[PDB]
Design a binder for this molecule. Sequence first.
Ligand SMILES: *[C@@H]1O[C@H](CO)[C@@H](O)[C@H](O)[C@H]1NC(C)=O
Lengths: 135, 128, 127
Amino acid sequence: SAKVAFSAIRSTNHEPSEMSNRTMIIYFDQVLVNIGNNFDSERSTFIAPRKGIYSFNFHVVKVYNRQTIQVSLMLNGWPVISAFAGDQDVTREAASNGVLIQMEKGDRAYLKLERGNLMGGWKYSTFSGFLVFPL
Amino acid sequence: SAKVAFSAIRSTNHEPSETMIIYFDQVLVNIGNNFDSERSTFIAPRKGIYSFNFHVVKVQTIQVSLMLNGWPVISAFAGDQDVTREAASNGVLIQMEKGDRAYLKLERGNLMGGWKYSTFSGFLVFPL
Amino acid sequence: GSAKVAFSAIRSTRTMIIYFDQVLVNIGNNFDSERSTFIAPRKGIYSFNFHVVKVYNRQTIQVSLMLNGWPVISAFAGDQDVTREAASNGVLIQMEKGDRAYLKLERGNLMGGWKYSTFSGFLVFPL
Ligand SMILES: *[C@@H]1O[C@H](CO)[C@@H](O)[C@H](O)[C@H]1NC(C)=O
């Protein structure tokens, strides 16, 4: 209803599943907040419970930054915003962006690795979201 | 009044138009219409705490300062190393009055090749 | 009233706790100790975001958001040659009354200082 919020973090440097390599969906294992449980089980897809304005924020951190990576915030399979990183030799680098989106009942919001790979594991990556107000 | 929010994106790599103000053509969210027509200015409709967030993406060292009534409040920097793209990002909460104007100014550098994928967001957290 | 909790601070000109002298917003006065410290007044979901600016070029820094002396999220800037690189991250947290949230310089020393570093947070909704 009025209180919907999720907060996830990848607490581990493990490689992606070969199921996750296909779908190109970035998943998060450690869930710090899930109010209304609309952020589902390690699929890392948010299901809008009702109509309203929602906030979204992500940071995709990588240990290996050789090849460029592009992360796109998806809405029902269509990209909304994008973040860019890679082509670096650094300690750790984050591809980060945030946006507010008007959602209708049942929309799906998730992160897709449009380009690059998650070799060496993404760790300390974050994905947050909450309902600002329903409309 | 109670529910105020905006959200905009630079959807094309087009060169800037003629004031040193970074505008965004694609508006996802505008609740209350307090974010003006295809430019960067948000006008506070009531006293309260407002959230603001911006990610200005480029393709030289540019400084983006979040302006409030003509003075800078926070600043972001994007030193151009050997990269395809780079973002100057920051965010803050500000206490604002009815009539205050928050917008993004490009203090240093220029945006050529476009500032595509740059975002700007903001909403009223609670009134006062 | 009790449902309105928000703070935001910048850094202008020990336990490795980063501080932000200029306080833009403090509603409820629950951010104190001349830094990014903040005690939750009530149980609920709180938002947090921070940008720690790596001023000097050749350094590497790591900033960890702390919850009662334990890291929750980490931000990284360094091993590069770019001036004023931001170690940034954000998270929502479930917290109870008395929980302390602050920023710790986990690795490195902010050289050239840190300036235009921001640290803000607010109560999304109580529980
Ligand atoms: C998924 O792709 C990454 C990057 O190539 C690889 O390291 C990982 O092993 C792949 N997953 C599986 C299950 O092989």
